[PDB]
A paper describes a structure:
Here we present two crystal structures of LaIHA, one bound to the hydrolytic product isatinate, and one bound to benzyl benzoate, as well as the apo structure of homologous RsIHA. Together with results from enzyme kinetic analysis, the resolved structures are used to describe the molecular basis for the Mn2+-dependent mechanism of hydrolysis, showing that [name] is a true orthologue of IHB. The highly conserved Mn2+ binding site is located at the bottom of the substrate-binding pocket.
The structures of LaIHA:benzyl benzoate and LaIHA:isatinate were determined at 1.50 Å and 1.79 Å resolution, respectively, while the one of RsIHA was determined at 2.65 Å resolution. The Mn2+ is found in an octahedral complex coordinated by His69, His73, Asp75, and two water molecules. Asp75 forms a bidentate contact in LaIHA:Benzyl benzoate and a mono-dentate electrostatic contact in the LaIHA:isatinate structures. The mono or bi-dentate coordination results in two or one water molecules as additional ligands, respectively, preserving the octahedral geometry. The side chain carbonyl of Gln219 in LaIHA (Ala224 in LaIHB) is found in alternative conformations, one of which coordinates Mn2+. The non-binding conformation allows additional water to approach to Mn2+ (W1025A/B). LaIHA shows the highest activity in the presence of Mn2+ confirming that this enzyme is Mn2+ dependent. Notably, LaIHA could not be activated in the presence of both Zn2+ and Cu2+.
Numbering used by the authors:
A (entry chain B): 2 to 257
B (entry chain A): 2 to 256
Amino acid sequence: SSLNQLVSGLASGAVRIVDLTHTLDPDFPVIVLPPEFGQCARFRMEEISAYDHRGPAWKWHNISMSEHTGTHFDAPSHWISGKDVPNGSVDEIPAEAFVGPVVVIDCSKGAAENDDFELTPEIIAGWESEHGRIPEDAWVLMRTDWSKRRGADYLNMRADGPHSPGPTPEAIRFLIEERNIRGFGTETVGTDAGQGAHYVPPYPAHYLLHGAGKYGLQCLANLDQLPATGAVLIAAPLKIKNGTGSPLRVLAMVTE
Amino acid sequence: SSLNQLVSGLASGAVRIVDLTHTLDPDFPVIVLPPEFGQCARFRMEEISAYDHRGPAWKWHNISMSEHTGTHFDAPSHWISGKDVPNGSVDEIPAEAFVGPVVVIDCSKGAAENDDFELTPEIIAGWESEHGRIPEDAWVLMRTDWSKRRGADYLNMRADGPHSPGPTPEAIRFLIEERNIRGFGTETVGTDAGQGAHYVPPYPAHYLLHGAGKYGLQCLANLDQLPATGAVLIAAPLKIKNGTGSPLRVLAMVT
Ligand SMILES: O=C(OCc1ccccc1)c1ccccc1
Ligand SMILES: O=C(OCc1ccccc1)c1ccccc1
Ligand SMILES: [Mn+2]
Ligand SMILES: [Mn+2]
């Protein structure tokens, strides 16, 4: 069976698990929005006990964050256009959606030359000319190697807001309507470009993906370790009551 | 590849995914300890915006809880016996540990007749007579259907503390030393029995599992959906800096 073979390959290393997750840490950057709006929180942790009088044989912590802190998953109810999608919160998404095929589009060269690099229909067509049609119900990850930025260059805020790569409205429309993807993931804090408020419609990845019942992943790491095709993504969010998203441990299984 | 077969089996329904997780909810019970100790927090959530003046096109929340709230994973650094284990925190555990074979020992009939039911070496031996030995580096789940208890029946507190099933020290030692298991999971708030402070050593599942660099799962649901053998568990904890555990979404793939 595929599962018996999977177990054997995982045990030998013929199938490797790549962790695509950043550490949840108080100093890891989170999305910043215009100052009139409520803001995403940083991760925070505090000891309950540490093998001391408060708990002599154990150590454990209280934790707090936002649904959108760190490496995290976006459900359709996160956007106003997804507010009527069935199974639209993280606690209702069917579990078969948490494991599936993934394709990785390498935009790292373009992102190194232009902070506002755009994933376009033409680039997707170029990718499919080499790797074949994107399979139905796949995750599509836009690799940029942005996850290697370790300071203020990660959010990359300028006077008019953040400058980071993302998809155009036409790219997202193509992936949804012509390829029926499961979701879209990036290495930045947004599935939209940093300047995505100025597309038509604003924040088109969010507006269109979630309006169509599709999912988002943000702040992925280590996409340069993945093949363009053939890997399997594990992206199971926390089962938050009526939740719009969650931090999560994103993994890819890779044949090697 | 074994991955292309998996993808097409998930798409066709030949492979199914069972969710083994309880919803994170302020009302779901969390572990309660003697009152002189620090306590686990309940899950809490509050809106940042809900398509409103605070965020006109989006809805999202702040959340708070403990590492050990809800369906959750225990890393070896959670116990004092785990102090000298390498890679003992949830952000350091090798990722291959997060997907693996699982076996399920059905103790539901015993738990229905004894709140303090004990999984013993004898019960494990009976299971192995039927199913063959527990595979090396497998997750072992003690099924009790305790996850069907709601409200106060789930913690099941009495004047002498909580009454819920769990393993004996000898059962855990057998699984670690003779079968080299990866970890142990239950449908209760602890990998130990509710009255497990009274074993030698106290809380032996925690003490022995984490002292051996092994993992725990607690508050699992839906274990009655799983076969005794052949399923694959997905249990990937949040990547908390130096974390001792985390809430997580536990799943099982079943053929
Ligand atoms: O990603 C969106 O902003 C795009 C973006 C991308 C990068 C940085 C900042 C913003 C977003 C997410 C949640 C709420 C509102 C907007
Ligand atoms: O596993 C027990 O507590 C161990 C423990 C001690 C301190 C912290 C975490 C875990 C347990 C089991 C059932 C009910 C209550 C407690
Ligand atoms: Mn988000
Ligand atoms: Mn715990």
